[PDB]
Amino acid sequence: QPIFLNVLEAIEPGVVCAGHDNNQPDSFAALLSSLNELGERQLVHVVKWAKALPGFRNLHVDDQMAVIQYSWMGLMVFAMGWRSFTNVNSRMLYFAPDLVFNEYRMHKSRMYSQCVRMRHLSQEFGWLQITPQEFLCMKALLLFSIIPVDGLKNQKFFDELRMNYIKELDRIIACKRKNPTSCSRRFYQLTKLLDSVQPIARELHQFTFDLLIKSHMVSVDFPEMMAEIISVQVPKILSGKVKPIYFHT
Ligand SMILES: N[C@@H](Cc1cc(I)c(Oc2ccc(O)c(I)c2)c(I)c1)C(=O)O
Ligand SMILES: C[C@]12CCC(=O)C[C@@H]1CC[C@@H]1[C@@H]2CC[C@]2(C)[C@@H](O)CC[C@@H]12
C-alpha cells in the first residue's frame, strides 16, 4: 500500500472501554454518564491519533486543538458507526464492548431519534460496501471538516492539508475501480456519506449542550475535558460561529 495508507492503518486507535457497570439497571443518568466517560477516554486517543496524522503538526498549534475540539463529535460517531457495522452488523450501536446500545437503551438514553440516525449511518457502511481503506481516509477528512467562519490562525496550511487528504481519498478510490462508470460515482457516494455525518453531529452537539446545562438536575456526570469543551467550544458551533465544511449544498 502507499505510505499514506500504512500510516492511517498504523495509527488507528484500538478498543476503548467506557467503564460502564452493566450490573446496574439502564437508567438515563447511568447511561449518559458512561457515554461521557467514554467520550473523555476517546478524546485522549483522538488527540494522539490526530497528532500522528501526516502533516497535522504542520498546522499552527492553536489550530490543532481547535479542529480537534470541533470535530471530535463527528469523528467518534463515524468511528462508532463503523464499529457497529463490523461487530454487530449495525444491529445495535457498538459504542464500546462494555456499552452496547439496544432498543431499550436507545429509549432510556432519551435520544432514540438520534440513535436511529446513527444506526442508519452505520448501515450505510454496509449498503455502500465501504472498504477499510475508504473508512480510514474518510475519518481523517472528518478531522478537517469543521472550522470557524472567520477562519483559523493559518487557513492557508489548513486548506492545503485538507486538499491533500481529499486527493488521497481519490487515489484510494482510483486504486481498484476498474469500472469506468463507478469511479466518479464512488467519490460522489463517499462525499455524500461524509456530509450526512454533520447533521447527526449537530444534533448531538445540541443534545449534549442542553444536558450539560441541566446536568445537576438529572444527575449526569461530565468529565473535566468534556465539560470544558462542551461549554466553550460546542456553543461556538451552535451559535453559528463554527460551521462544518460540506461538499454538496
Ligand atoms: N502521498 C504520500 C504521502 C503524502 C501525504 C500527505 I497528507 C502529504 O501532504 C503534506 C503536505 C505538506 C506537509 O508539510 C506534509 I508533513 C504533508 C504529502 I507532500 C505526501 C505517500 O503516499 O507516500
Ligand atoms: C461521542 C460519544 C462517545 C464515543 C462514541 O462512540 C460515539 C458517541 C456518540 C454520542 C455521544 C458520546 C459522548 C457523550 C455524549 C456527547 C452525550 O453527552 C450525548 C451524546 C453522547
From Swiss-Prot:
Location(s), subcellular: Nucleus; Cytoplasm
Protein name: Androgen receptor
Residues recorded with modification Phosphotyrosine: Y246
Phenotypic consequence of V77M: In PAIS and AIS
Miscellaneous field: In the absence of ligand, steroid hormone receptors are thought to be weakly associated with nuclear components; hormone binding greatly increases receptor affinity. The hormone-receptor complex appears to recognize discrete DNA sequences upstream of transcriptional start sites. Transcriptional activity is enhanced by binding to RANBP9.
Site (Interaction with coactivator FXXLF and FXXFY motifs): E228
Region: Interaction with CCAR1, residue numbers: 1-249
Whole-protein residues included: 671 to 919 of 920
Effect of G14A: Found in prostate cancer
Consequence the record notes for mutating L211Q: In prostate cancer
Domain NR LBD: 1-230
Covalent cross-link site, Glycyl lysine isopeptide (Lys-Gly) (interchain with G-Cter in ubiquitin): K176, K178
Family the UniProt entry places it in: Belongs to the nuclear hormone receptor family. NR3 subfamily.
Effect of I3T: In prostate cancer
Substitution effect: M111I: In PAIS and AIS
Subunit annotation: Binds DNA as a homodimer. Part of a ternary complex containing AR, EFCAB6/DJBP and PARK7. Interacts with HIPK3 and NR0B2 in the presence of androgen. The ligand binding domain interacts with KAT7/HBO1 in the presence of dihydrotestosterone. Interacts with EFCAB6/DJBP, PQBP1, RANBP9, RBAK, SPDEF, SRA1, TGFB1I1 and RREB1. Interacts with ZMIZ1/ZIMP10 and ZMIZ2/ZMIP7 which both enhance its transactivation activity. Interacts with SLC30A9 and RAD54L2/ARIP4. Interacts with MACROD1 (via macro domain).
Effect the entry attributes to changing A96T: In AIS; loss of androgen binding
Effect of G55D: In AIS and prostate cancer
Disulphides: none
UniProt note: domains: Composed of three domains: a modulating N-terminal domain, a DNA-binding domain and a C-terminal ligand-binding domain. In the presence of bound steroid the ligand-binding domain interacts with the N-terminal modulating domain, and thereby activates AR transcription factor activity. Agonist binding is required for dimerization and binding to target DNA. The transcription factor activity of the complex formed by ligand-activated AR and DNA is modulated by interactions with coactivator and corepressor proteins.
Gene name of the record: AR
Phenotype for L93F: In AIS; loss of androgen binding
Linked pathology: Androgen insensitivity syndrome: An X-linked recessive form of pseudohermaphroditism due end-organ resistance to androgen. Affected males have female external genitalia, female breast development, blind vagina, absent uterus and female adnexa, and abdominal or inguinal testes, despite a normal 46,XY karyotype. Spinal and bulbar muscular atrophy X-linked 1: An X-linked recessive form of spinal muscular atrophy. Spinal muscular atrophy refers to a group of neuromuscular disorders characterized by degeneration of the anterior horn cells of the spinal cord, leading to symmetrical muscle weakness and atrophy. SMAX1 occurs only in men. Age at onset is usually in the third to fifth decade of life, but earlier involvement has been reported. It is characterized by slowly progressive limb and bulbar muscle weakness with fasciculations, muscle atrophy, and gynecomastia.
Result after altering M80I: In prostate cancer
Effect of K176R: Prevents ubiquitination by RNF6. Prevents AR transcriptional activation by RNF14 in absence of hormone
Chain intervals for the UniProt region annotation (Interaction with KAT7): 1-249
Record organism: Homo sapiens (Human)
